[PDB]
Symmetry: D2
């Protein structure tokens, strides 16, 4: 009996899926720690007889041995049915299971919240974006005793950082479809939106670029905006933003919405400003002098080796396996 | 973004050497930052064509175009399974390293019909790692035309078992099964023979029960000689394969006795790791005649050579060189 | 481009547990991609001041601004060396993790506390064996704000674990010159002492010759109980540290018996790894009574818990968390 | 007797030093393989007394033990005296020594030939020699180098994850080296533009675009947009520039003779040309499809350079050969 740690990893999604991006990046760190990938392909679950699905899963977990530990990165995006039966398959082994939450599907839409929580409760440790997320999940019946807070996505990279000049512009590499505040841009601060989609005056569309390029370009100065839409104001209070990690790894300060999860990280480390609303953000971008920009930048760049070396991830990947056995 | 993947069987008996080698190789591959494609040993005919195909899709779900895959063959799931795994792999734009642990039609007179199908699927790899040059030669004669070949040379035996000081015990160690090795029963000499096995034999042969490898290593290190031998039934294969027993003796820290004609025998010759003997009589005779002086030297050569074995360097180099060859012309 | 380095001592006797520890932490560290800053144990007074300085420049030659350095203390080259290594480290723009294996000023050695504390305080993060250790260190002026608790030693190993039978015997792989209760051993339960010392022992102590750790693990895994016991003058200083042999028993796969108030005692209780006893006499009683099933369970707890020990997870978490903390 | 592998690595040179860049790249690969760094700092050896030197060295190798293997990246650039002395220290341990040659000082010009005997003497204490090219090994043998086990490096790697942009057929030649070292640049006289990436002040001939020095990753991204990489100058060693071009994902043009050119030919990675004028011709005549093919070749071969495989093999093979 010789313990190995395995971790699930999705494959086959779009060139531009942040979801897969997250998992693959977590997995690369995990591989570097000695862990083993359980590759999972993103496909149409209805395409399998319930029996072919049982055996595709046997294919996926073929290397598993009792005494192992499995880190399940949820969701698989293969349907709650897949999630459920993957879990069920793992519960047949005499192993500890770490549930690593990237998103809670119902949070839209809301109905399957119950079957979601239900297989969640089968894990031994839960890793979640924030304590607020854990608290809110307990409210729906989540009863796993050992929980670990993720805090922040890393963003492992060796993209050169150029000196950050005080450009009074704002960067935002999300998609307008999901963020409608972007179409409502009123202010005379340029908003640089990085997206594939083609949809005001001061918003400037920029072509989707490989992540390393975006980082290099963003490092030349400016501010990074982390901002949700108005129903997404639920999550935001709960999830970890991926682009937040991308701003910080690039070496520029951030502007986040008052009430975002884990805001303490931003404050304690002097990484940017927590503002009430867009207006206040604009104001600060207009007010900030050369001095206080130079400070925020140096704060970001003394902080970001954590992000670029993948330590929030190495941290939770190590602690959760230990808590599972301990 | 190229990743390197390696297949690894699972599910066989704890006593199975085939799985033991594959796991060990995998353990070394993982340390090199490679990725496991786990494969479970089961009865292939409990699947419909659709199900087997989808079990394979599950096994290879993480592969992408541009990756490299090392197929550790055989899977012991049948030539049929090997062939369809290979077929799946060829749908990807990847390079395939075929790493041969055994050639199943060459190792049993009755498995020979499978030669042609085995070769056909061998010829789909970009690189073949074979135990010996002689095995590659033999493969060629049966139609194997894979242009790039790497010689494995020897099985490592990664470990940290204590090595005790080796005294000149005039005994011979043999951790194999009497079934696969019938000569055991016809043991007739007055030099003791220790047979380590889970399984009925002559007076000068002592049966010791199957221990976990680590303990076997510690015990063997106390001295004596490791015998690497095969019956005349397998004299053919012997000139071709790599013995795992060989690597276990040397890792333990004792000299070995091997039959003339065995694969990669110059390895033993040039590193002074034991004796190449014509027959069992010549070995028994050398064990009775060797003096303290000579045994001292042999043990010295073995324990200066065997860091390679214990740190997995034969495996590290084939794992590194084969992936390199798969890409570079 | 940040690298993590970790100090590691070399040159001590194959018997030195202090080196065995640093070396083990270092091995885990290297598997995590950290880099060794090798330190050799020698007579410091053989060095002129400038020689000592440049020997140190030799040790840290590979360091760069922006690196993170883990200092496993002490080096055993004496405090003067520890202090001079720390100052050398502070000359770089790096974050420093202090990893405490022992604290020298802890009775007549106490006078050294001022110097010891003054260099501890140059660290950004302190990893200490127990919270208790951290508290005592605070009473004497340690003010490093980020601290991590180690909570056990690991024992990474591949040692076969045999099935464990209930044997009413106690294993103690400790030097009997350092533990006196051994010479006083007066009980009908056999005490098995694994030691290099060529001396004879009380009637019911079985002197067993020193053996490679791997062999010791395998042998102990056949059953019996592992005793973690301190002398008497090492009693206060006891409560503080992490027992290395404790880790060895659990990694072998047998339950343990430890004195009341041992550092990180709750780990034993919360995981069902053995018993906390007042004194030897209670320990003898438990071993006399303890039944077959109750033992079976003790073992089950141990072997479900010990893959953490055997794969080095206490160390992996402290090496990972302390670096994170040094930057955060 | 637990064998560990160590590798020397220089530190403390300028950010522009290719020697350091190389030793550091090899070392990072070595660390991923589990090998341990012996960090060496570049200073002025005259500032040490004999005793101080001996103890600085003792500080550098404090972690070695009998039974280890040591890979010595030579030269250290602290001089031959330092290299000889480091080699002397190592020999005092019962270890095997791999000598990995980056440069041979006494072969740099005839003036430095007097150093050959000292150089060869200490080379000969090694158990294995890794050299850039077989040709180099042959030359060394002519001067008394007698280490029986040798390994050929072939090519520098270039570990990176720089995005590769699509390679447009730009009729331009990239050359990230400095002028004060390459005469041919100041003499440029072709209607084909030469993109020279340098930190130097100097203004440059008409059809040269002096581009400011830039981080390696950025350089790689820019070059991946297309055009040709030029390797120009001692066909003894491996060009580091070469690996940068191929990692960036564009084909190369190299001067006839240089070492290991059959790597170029056998993988269809560029052109081996007699002179500069031959290079301008091929850049003028080459058509769209011929160029898509070059790029195909380079981008299929690339992953070796980018994942550090020339280095992984020499680091694995040489340690193996040191014991076997
Ligand atoms: O041109 C682009 C724009 C987006 N991104 C990536 O997409 C991320 C943001 O995606 P998403 O909005 O889904 O992250 P979220 O903040 O919502 O968690 C950025 O940080 C980048 O990593 C990118 O690689 N190139
Ligand atoms: O008591 C035993 C006897 C055998 N072995 C293992 O079984 C191997 C021999 O198996 P096999 O005879 O199949 O090796 P090969 O024929 O390839 O030389 C030995 O080297 C050991 O590693 C073991 O672990 N415990
Ligand atoms: O025959 C022996 C006896 C001791 N030890 C090692 O020495 C440790 C105990 O040493 P020490 O008492 O110094 O550690 P402590 O428990 O006091 O921290 C054991 O756990 C073993 O790992 C060993 O390897 N072989
Ligand atoms: O703007 C620049 C110019 C050059 N270089 C680096 O310098 C290398 C060339 O160095 P050198 O000419 O010394 O190498 P050589 O080809 O002579 O071996 C390039 O490959 C780059 O990696 C760079 O990073 N940025």
């Amino acid at each position: 009996a010789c313990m190995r740690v395995y971790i699930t990893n999705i494959n086959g999604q779009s060139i531009q899926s942040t979801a897969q991006l997250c998992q693959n990046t977590v997995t690369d760190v995990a591989v570097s720690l000695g862990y083993r990938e359980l590759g999972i392909y993103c496909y149409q679950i209805h395409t399998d007889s319930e029996s072919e699905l049982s055996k595709r899963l046997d294919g996926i977990v073929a290397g598993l041995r009792h005494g192992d530990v499995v880190i399940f990165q949820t969701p698989t995006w293969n349907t709650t049915e897949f999630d459920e039966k993957l879990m069920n398959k793992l519960k047949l082994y005499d192993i500890k299971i770490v549930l690593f939450i990237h998103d809670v599907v119902p949070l839209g839409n809301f109905y399957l919240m119950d079957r979601t929580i239900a297989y969640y409760n089968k894990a031994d440790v839960v890793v979640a974006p924030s304590q607020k997320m854990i608290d809110k999940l307990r409210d729906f019946g989540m009863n796993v005793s050992k929980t670990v807070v993720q805090g922040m996505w890393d963003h492992p990279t060796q993209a050169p950082m150029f000196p950050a000049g005080l450009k009074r512009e704002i960067h935002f590499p999300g998609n307008p479809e999901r963020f409608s505040f972007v179409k409502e841009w009123k202010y005379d601060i340029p908003l640089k939106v990085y997206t594939w989609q083609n949809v005001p005056q001061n918003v400037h569309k920029i072509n989707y670029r490989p992540d390393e390029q975006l980082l290099m370009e963003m490092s030349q100065g400016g501010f990074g905006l982390v901002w949700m839409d108005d129903k997404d104001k639920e999550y935001q209070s709960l999830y970890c933003s991926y682009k937040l990690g991308s701003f910080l790894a690039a070496g520029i300060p951030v502007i986040v919405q008052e009430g975002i999860a884990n805001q303490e990280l931003i404050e304690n480390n002097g990484l940017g400003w927590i503002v009430k609303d867009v207006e206040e953000a604009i104001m600060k971008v207009k007010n900030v002098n050369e001095d206080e920009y130079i400070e925020l930048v140096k704060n970001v760049r003394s902080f970001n080796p954590i992000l670029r070396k993948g330590f929030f991830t190495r941290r939770l990947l190590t602690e959760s396996v230990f808590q599972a056995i301990c």
